[PDB]
Design a protein around this ligand. Structure first.
Ligand SMILES: CN1CN([C@@H]2O[C@H](COP(=O)(O)OP(=O)(O)OP(=O)(O)O)[C@@H](O)[C@H]2O)c2nc(N)[nH]c(=O)c21
Lengths: 327, 327
């Protein structure tokens, strides 16, 4: 288990400890994680490798830091002439009907990027462009720079040349001001702010995957329906962050068997956060009246315009009748 | 208005003219497109615009290139220290349990990439890697570079570290020898290899999108079923390239209305090219016995293991009976 993999595993343990109760990101937290799960590589190795986020704060506590994590401490302008190029979908292979391209200033945190999403519509392509950036930046100059890079990157499509700065949805993130932060439900709550920063959940080995599913059910179990009706919107969004990540780890039969949807306190969470949950298999609706429902284009019922049927356990008599079609 | 929009439309004019009539890619072809889509900007601003493909060939002709396009002239190793990142799903958010990443050398043509597709299965992670590259490359050494970049990029390098070069499928494309090419159905036919080089289809504006769709239908309409059975494989694959792009532009209702699938000669295209077509909305199967079928996990038919049901147009009286559920 290298130094990175151990760093990954300690971050897993902090995320898992965030499920049952909020915890301030400070060295004691990392210390409790090291109990059942120590750091076995050398501290000298750790002084070499460079990581970011909470794994860097794990590294610094392993290297003796006694102060708590300070929101905004990672701030960085990035290199204005080094760009990162990433994309999902293409015009020839779009994904869920869309293709999206994001170009950003390398090593910028918060990340200063221009994302251009596109789809085929009647009359050609519609584009939706988002400039994710920081308060006070030269937005127009930034846009015009990242736009050029989009044009040069994708062989100058007409559709991108047509996007004006006035077409661009601008999102200004604030840098922290050094607020201490609380980790709860895989999300950071900076003290003094109302927003959260959702963190990557991790938990990709079998053991931590099974722990994550266990802890979430127990966490919800540890709330009364009144407890849920009292939570701030920010903790609810935090819980949403974890719930949706868990259900993407199940097929429909496992998800229903998991049983989190059957709990009273979770029904109160469904009223505040929504009933529609993607899974590994498709999408379920945990409805308070109809029961468990499953996405189904042949559905006689609709939930927020999603066609659904009653999810029932797949039994072999339905599949024996599946008509194999001539090629 | 502008030079980029003009270049695109000269490029669209070639792609569109190629649907019905094959033509050598040489400067006289761009001359005759300039009749319908002139170039009003100055050659001096033309010289800053960086393009590839036919867009760059047009630019070169406008700047006075009088030689014909030579297959393989765009071949470039790329920068082995600059990388592009394509992802389809995520370890945090997989798509139907899968996530795929492709990392490639920036500006490599043919593209040299390593594609790792990964799934969460019972217990661990199954990976499949493909190295798409060029005849003659240092395959192992390219794999090890691209695998490193995949380890640095991954939210889960543990599952990547175990993939060995013996586990990786290699596809090698060949570079051209300077052959002249014919453009037909948006594809280059080098004289006289047996393969084609599919070209990107632009047509991002109202005029060229609508005409792209009417020409493809006109092309098929003006072949009988006997004409289609006499098409070589390379011409079948070119038609396939225009058919599949066109159907990515419609939702399912629009794809069906377009009616290309009702032409008897298209039924012969279907037998020879496949029945499964991706649209903007779903996957459709143009079946010869059952009609238009739509991918449907809960369908009672299967086409080549694809679960499907009969596609059904929205009818207001039926939509009126859909039980709208309470939120
Ligand atoms: C680590 N895991 C595990 N997992 C899901 O959880 C299951 C893993 O297999 P498993 O349930 O542990 O096997 P097991 O219960 O012992 O036997 P069975 O075959 O009956 O399920 C799979 O259905 C897989 O989709 C995951 N799903 C997502 N989205 N991300 C993840 O990191 C993980």
């Amino acid at each position: 288990p290298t130094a990175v993999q151990e760093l990954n595993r300690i971050c897993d343990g902090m995320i898992l400890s965030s499920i049952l109760r909020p915890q301030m990101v400070e060295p004691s937290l990392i210390g409790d994680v090291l109990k059942t799960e120590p750091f076995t590589s050398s501290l000298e190795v750790l002084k070499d490798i460079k990581v970011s986020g909470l794994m860097r704060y794990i590294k610094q506590v392993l290297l003796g830091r006694k102060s708590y994590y300070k929101f905004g401490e990672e701030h960085a302008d990035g290199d204005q002439n080094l760009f990162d190029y990433q994309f999902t979908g293409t015009p020839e292979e779009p994904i869920k009907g869309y293709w999206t391209t994001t170009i950003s200033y390398r090593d910028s945190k918060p990340k200063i990027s221009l994302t251009i999403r596109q789809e085929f519509v009647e009359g050609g392509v519609e584009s939706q462009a988002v400039l994710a950036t920081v308060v006070g930046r030269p937005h127009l100059q930034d846009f015009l720079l990242l736009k050029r890079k989009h044009l040069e990157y994708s062989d100058y499509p007409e559709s991108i040349d047509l996007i004006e700065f006035g077409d661009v949805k601008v999102i200004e993130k604030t840098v922290g001001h050094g607020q201490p932060v609380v980790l709860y439900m895989a999300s950071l709550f900076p003290i003094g702010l109302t927003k959260i920063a959702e963190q990557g959940i991790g938990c990709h080995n079998e053991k931590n995957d099974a722990t994550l599913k266990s802890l979430l059910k127990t966490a919800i179990l540890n709330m009364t329906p009144d407890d849920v009706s009292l939570l701030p919107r920010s903790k609810l969004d935090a819980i949403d962050h974890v719930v949706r990540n868990v259900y993407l780890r199940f097929n429909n039969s496992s998800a229903v068997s998991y049983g989190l949807h059957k709990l009273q306190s979770f029904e109160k969470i469904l009223q505040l956060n929504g009933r529609i949950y993607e899974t590994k298999e498709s999408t379920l609706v945990f409805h308070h009246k109809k029961g468990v429902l499953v996405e189904d284009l042949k559905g006689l019922m609709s939930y927020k315009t999603l066609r659904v049927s009653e999810w029932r356990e797949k039994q072999e008599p339905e599949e024996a009748r599946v008509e194999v079609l001539e090629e």
